[PDB]
């Protein structure tokens, strides 16, 4: 029988590994504090305003 | 990856990215062949174009549809999303969930249901009752079809099994067609078309049989797009859930002592499950039932024929018993 | 000591750990759900 | 590489959200899912949290259970004659907060 | 570089976010009771609940017949010797209390 020799072929038809979408980062509170290296211990101190009772 | 800031050990672990691949093969030769003795060609065939070529094209088109349906139904499905006939929508919503939790794109999805599934959707109280489904201008009741459910249009088809539905993304199933070339030795022949597929028609005169011969064919190949881990997530299969089966016709008497009869078993949905049942005879001395539901009588007297059907949900086989009376 | 020597522990990191404001959370993939770490429920410091 | 880092950042945020110190986890009954969300609204109204700028991110299974609920499927039980929860699968607004579906969080949360 | 924080109250209680979880009433094993092809063969059990979630990572597996087939703590099960083994998967639901149980039977050739 005839034994032809043919090359391997690799093609891309648009099938890809399925991966979810990115929705979380657009929801959380990003960068309300910026200068972290300026303060000591990489810690910014946030102050809660005082409250009083009559 | 992720590492703690200012960690004393400054070690990063490399991430390796790999590429995967899969093979698409051409391995079928759908064809339709005909022979015509010279007498038939001269006399029987009044209009060759209409009496011969058109039936061949239609037959090969139906065979191609059967090939596609075999591809769709035979794909490796991990689990079957059972459809409860009393309340069918949760099954379809679960199918949508399973495809959406695998990040399959939401567009270009096809939902193809059998005849039984469409009938069940029409008979479902969710769609039939106006208050439960909006649409006071009732469509599942006046007409007998539901238009859209679970965010996907429904398409009926008799090609697939009656009680099956399939929801698949465009990129799940791949088909390829190669039209054979007309060999130089063989006489030149025209090329026809079936559902947009080009097919080669070839003619050759058999002098030994004193008759013409024709052959209309095409090369076909199919592929199911699995994932890199071997799982199949691009398509989901739904099957109607059978509660009980009944043998149509009730108690019946054979025509003669050596009479024969063909049985038909229908579940509560009316679907013919005769090819999916196993038949047994209480007394094979007088009446014997084959594996295909063909009951025959070998001696006079009364016997019991039972049919056992393993439901799509599995478990104990549903049993339907009928009594035959050979005269 | 030497350039080729392994990195010494960061005094900034030591002080930050001492202040105890780094965020620790329950594991996502632990069943049953883990208890709240003692750091996550500490009260705010009384003095700014 | 950029896609991997983006997904790692999203996983970081999801770890933050799910790992937060919660005293209790409100249980959603699949048969009746609305009382759980109204109870969550009650819990946050009791603590005097402002009403505006509230986000509700549900896992895939929770959204499926919302769609499967008779409270949203049956048009006589939810108004909405053009049945959104049956014709489509999204439920949309629920107990005064737009539902956002995310696969980063655990499926049933 | 990145950092995350939750804004707890003055006394440490967290009241600005609520976690809701979907109840589970029963668990099943995908694939049903089926026999293993060979002793060296391995099969990874899949567990689900009535909500449709995947709870395989949340279940604990045990084997009635250890000398026939042994199941790992992650659901993977491998045969040992011919016979029958009654594998069980126990899942403690989010509601807590009694652990739901799913039983499967495996036949080692």
């Amino acid at each position: 029988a005839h034994i032809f020799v043919k090359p391997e072929l690799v093609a891309e038809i648009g099938v890809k590994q399925l991966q979810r979408e990115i929705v979380l980062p657009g929801l959380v509170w990003t960068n309300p504090l910026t200068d972290f290296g300026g303060s000591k211990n990489d810690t910014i101190t946030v102050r809660v305003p005082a409250i009083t009772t009559a | 990856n992720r590492r703690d800031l200012r960690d004393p050990d400054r070690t990063v672990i490399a991430s390796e990215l790999v590429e995967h691949s899969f093979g698409v093969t051409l391995d079928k030769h759908v064809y339709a062949a005909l022979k015509f003795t010279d007498e038939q060609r001269t006399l029987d065939i009044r209009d060759y174009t209409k009496q011969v070529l058109m039936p061949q094209v239609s037959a090969v088109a139906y065979e191609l549809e059967d090939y596609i349906a075999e591809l769709i139904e035979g794909a490796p499905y991990e689990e079957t999303i059972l459809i409860d006939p009393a309340d069918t929508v949760p099954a379809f919503i679960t199918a949508d969930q399973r495809m959406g939790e695998a990040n399959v794109p939401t567009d270009s999805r096809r939902l193809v249901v059998g005849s039984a599934v469409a009938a069940a959707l029409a008979k479902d109280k969710q769609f039939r009752h106006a208050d439960w489904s909006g649409d006071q201008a009732n469509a599942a009741l006046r007409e007998a079809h539901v238009g859209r459910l679970a965010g996907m249009n429904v398409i009926r088809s008799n090609a697939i099994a009656p009680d099956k539905a399939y929801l698949w993304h465009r990129t799940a199933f791949i088909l390829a067609y190669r039209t054979p070339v007309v060999p130089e030795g063989a006489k030149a022949g025209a090329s026809f078309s079936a559902n947009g597929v080009a097919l080669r028609w070839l003619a050759d005169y058999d002098y030994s049989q004193l008759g013409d011969r024709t052959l209309l064919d095409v090369f076909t190949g199919r592929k199911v797009v699995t994932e890199v881990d071997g799982s199949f997530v691009r398509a989901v299969e739904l099957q109607l859930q059978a509660s009980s089966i009944t043998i149509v016709g009730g108690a019946f008497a054979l025509a003669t002592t050596t009479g024969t009869k063909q049985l038909k078993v229908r579940d509560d949905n009316g679907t013919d499950v005769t090819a999916r049942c196993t038949f047994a005879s209480s007394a094979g001395t007088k009446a014997t039932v084959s594996a295909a539901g063909l009951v025959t009588g070998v001696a006079a007297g009364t016997a019991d024929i039972t049919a056992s059907y393993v439901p799509p949900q599995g478990g104990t086989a549903k049993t339907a018993t009928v009594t035959v009376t050979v005269p | 000591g030497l350039i080729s020597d392994p990195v010494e522990v960061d005094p900034i990191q030591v002080g930050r750990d001492e202040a105890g404001w780094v965020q620790e959370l329950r594991d996502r993939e632990a069943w049953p759900k883990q208890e709240v770490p003692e750091q996550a429920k500490k009260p705010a410091k009384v003095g700014n």
Side-chain angles (χ1 to χ4, degrees), chain A, chain B, chain C:
Chain A
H2 307 85
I3 304 304
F4 294 103
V5 61
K6 290 174 269 186
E8 77 270 8
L9 267 70
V10 167
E12 311 215 356
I13 60 173
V15 61
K16 294 187 287 184
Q17 303 193 11
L18 311 156
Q19 263 168 326
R20 57 163 183 284
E21 56 277 354
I22 289 302
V23 60
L24 275 183
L27 300 173
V28 298
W29 203 16
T30 187
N31 279 316
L33 302 169
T34 67
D35 188 3
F36 281 85
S39 159
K40 55 186 304 192
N41 301 324
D42 295 333
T43 287
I44 291 290
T45 287
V46 187
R47 157 175 62 229
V48 185
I51 200 172
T52 315
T53 54
Chain B
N1 295 267
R2 182 188 294 115
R3 66 178 292 278
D4 287 351
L5 205 48
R6 296 168 184 283
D7 202 3
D9 63 324
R10 296 284 186 179
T11 296
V12 291
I13 61 171
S15 70
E16 185 178 2
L17 55 89
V18 299
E19 273 178 341
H20 299 100
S21 74
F22 59 95
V24 193
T25 316
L26 193 75
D27 46 23
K28 289 299 283 290
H29 185 188
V30 176
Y31 78 96
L34 275 191
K35 57 192 288 184
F36 276 134
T37 65
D38 217 342
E39 308 96 358
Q40 286 182 354
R41 176 71 181 79
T42 308
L43 312 171
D44 191 294
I45 296 178
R46 65 182 180 179
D47 203 334
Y48 186 72
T49 307
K50 187 178 75 66
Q51 289 188 175
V52 176
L53 295 184
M54 301 302 174
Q56 276 187 170
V57 172
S58 282
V60 74
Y62 284 139
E63 186 64 26
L64 289 188
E65 187 194 9
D66 280 352
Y67 190 60
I68 306 180
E70 289 155 27
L71 165 65
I72 281 184
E73 303 181 54
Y77 293 104
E78 306 110 339
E79 79 271 11
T80 291
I81 305 163
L82 299 171
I83 296 181
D84 195 31
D87 201 60
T88 62
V89 184
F92 289 90
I93 300 193
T94 305
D96 193 7
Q97 161 193 358
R98 293 188 203 277
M99 279 187 69
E101 91 187 344
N103 323 296
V104 177
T106 182
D107 51 353
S108 74
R109 280 180 202 183
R110 299 294 181 182
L111 169 61
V112 159
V113 300
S115 46
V117 179
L121 284 184
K123 295 194 284 218
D124 197 345
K125 276 199 189 50
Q126 172 61 72
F127 302 100
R128 206 167 77 230
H129 288 321
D131 55 351
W132 291 14
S133 85
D135 68 358
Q136 317 299 133
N138 221 354
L141 171 58
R142 298 320 174 187
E143 273 63 26
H145 84 276
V146 288
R148 155 190 277 283
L149 73 165
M152 51 195 172
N153 282 262
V154 59
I155 296 147
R156 274 140 269 172
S157 159
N158 301 336
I160 64 174
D163 65 335
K164 312 301 288 323
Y166 301 92
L167 166 66
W168 77 84
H169 184 234
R170 156 175 284 295
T171 80
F173 305 114
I174 280 159
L175 286 181
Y177 302 116
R178 276 304 305 274
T179 286
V181 301
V182 183
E184 298 87 16
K187 194 179 181 293
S191 161
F192 294 91
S193 178
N195 295 325
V197 171
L199 282 75
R200 171 209 79 171
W201 178 84
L202 181 140
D204 178 271
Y205 185 84
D206 190 7
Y207 177 97
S208 294
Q209 290 321 101
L210 268 178
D212 195 36
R213 297 174 304 187
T214 56
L215 173 78
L216 180 67
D217 58 350
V218 69
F219 293 153
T220 66
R222 65 196 174 188
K223 177 59 183 175
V224 162
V225 177
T226 60
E227 299 321 300
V228 307
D229 47 299
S231 60
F232 189 36
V233 311
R234 304 286 179 97
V236 289
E237 177 190 18
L238 295 83
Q239 184 148 20
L240 266 175
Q241 184 176 359
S243 76
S244 77
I245 57 159
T246 60
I247 301 185
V248 76
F252 71 110
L254 267 179
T256 64
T257 315
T258 175
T260 191
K261 170 71 159 314
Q262 183 52 260
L263 287 175
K264 287 180 67 65
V265 180
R266 287 184 188 271
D267 54 351
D268 61 350
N269 313 311
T271 300
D272 195 347
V273 287
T274 308
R276 329 194 197 160
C277 294
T278 57
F279 297 92
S281 184
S282 81
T285 75
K286 64 179 80 71
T288 79
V289 65
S290 174
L294 184 66
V295 60
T296 52
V298 289
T302 179
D304 277 17
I305 308 280
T306 178
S308 64
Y309 171 48
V310 188
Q313 61 265 36
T316 70
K318 301 316 171 45
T319 286
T321 60
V322 71
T323 71
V324 71
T325 55
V326 193
Chain C
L2 275 64
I3 291 298
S4 63
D5 265 351
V7 170
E8 193 185 359
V9 300
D10 269 6
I12 304 169
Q13 188 263 339
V14 166
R16 162 193 86 177
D17 289 335
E18 193 271 332
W21 283 122
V22 297
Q23 182 79 347
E24 45 198 50
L25 308 165
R26 323 189 298 192
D27 194 303
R28 284 165 72 188
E29 272 64 58
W31 200 250
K33 50 197 200 77
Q34 294 181 353
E35 275 201 6
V36 174
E38 90 296 339
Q39 184 270 311
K41 43 194 194 56
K42 72 164 67 173
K45 170 68 179 325
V46 76
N48 82 92

